[PDB]
Amino acid sequence: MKGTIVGTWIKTLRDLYGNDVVDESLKSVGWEPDRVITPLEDIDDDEVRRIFAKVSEKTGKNVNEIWREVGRQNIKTFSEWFPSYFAGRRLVNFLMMMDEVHLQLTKMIKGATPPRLIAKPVAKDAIEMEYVSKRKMYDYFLGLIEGSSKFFKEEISVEEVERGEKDGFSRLKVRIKFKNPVFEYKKN
Ligand code: HEM
């Protein structure tokens, strides 16, 4: 997992559960105190899993609930650390550019496996976004979407269209419907 992104999760976990829980969890995996992660750094997915397992143990909360809460709260963290991706954008534009952003931020990582997040308009007021990744981080995915709605102050309804798993890849397709129209038909 891209290091700086794990960095956002650490900050978000501190916001949710406190420095004691987080410090203890990072200590359990040998994380240097006040460790600063650099842009080219990659952090083992298993290390991330172990950090979250410790937070779960200490807070008594199920790991899936933690990922859901982290997703909901991490958008704020992203808006502070990566402000350029939010400036002058509407929620629909933000969501539609995510697939490209994830490809961009993982390009120079050995064995890059970013999640695919292809979104496609399906109506004047809705898009279908399909999460595809071997990591099966459904709760985090859904949480970020909810947090994005809150950050952009644009109400949406989210319905699952379908989910599945094949050859190690998990997929979750959701239909995101906006209160007001966001698209209009134009000649192709
Ligand atoms: C400006 C905001 C965002 C940035 C900069 C960003 C960046 C990233 C990056 C680089 C990773 C690491 C991937 C890897 O190392 O393979 C990641 C993970 C992830 N991102 Fe984002 N992300 C943002 C917003 C979102 C949003 C809005 C969604 C979903 C609607 C999303 C869904 C995910 C998921 C589910 C993962 C977890 C890894 C996986 O499932 O395979 N991200 N993000």
Q: Is 78 in the pocket of ligand 1 (CB under 6 A)?
A: yes
Token code pair at residue 146: 């909810």
Judge contact between 178 and 156, C-beta under 8 A. yes
Question: Which residue CA neighbors atom 35 of ligand 1 most closely?
Answer: 141
Token code pair at residue 30: 């040998």
Domain of 85, in residue numbers:
1-188
Q: Output the CA 150–ligand 1 centroid distance in Å.
A: 17
Q: Which atom of ligand 1 is nearest to 75's Cα?
A: 2
Q: Is there a binding annotation on residue 133?
A: yes
Please give the resolution of this entry in Å, rounded to 1 decimal.
1.8
Token code pair at residue 58: 């200490």
Q: Is there a binding annotation on residue 140?
A: no
Beta strand segments in the chain, E = 116-123, 126-133, 156-166, 169-178
CA 3 centroid distance within chain: 14
Judge contact between 59 and 17, C-beta under 8 A. yes
Question: Which residue CA neighbors atom 32 of ligand 1 most closely?
Answer: 141
Of the CA atoms within 13 Å of residue 85, those in its CB half-sphere come to: 21
Judge contact between 130 and 116, C-beta under 8 A. yes
Q: Is there a binding annotation on residue 131?
A: yes
Q: Is 138 in the pocket of ligand 1 (CB under 6 A)?
A: no
Q: What separation in angstroms does the CA of 41 have from each of 6, 12, 70, 169?
A: 10, 19, 21, 24
Please give the Cα distance from 109 to 40 (Å, whole number).
Answer: 7
Q: Return the CATH number at 167.
A: 3.90.1520.10
Domain count, the chain: 1
Q: What separation in angstroms does the CA of 162 have from each of 86, 132, 142, 171, 173?
A: 29, 12, 14, 8, 5
Q: Helices 19-28 and 3-17 meet at what angle, rounded to 10?
A: 140
Sign of CA dihedral 5, 11, 12, 18: positive
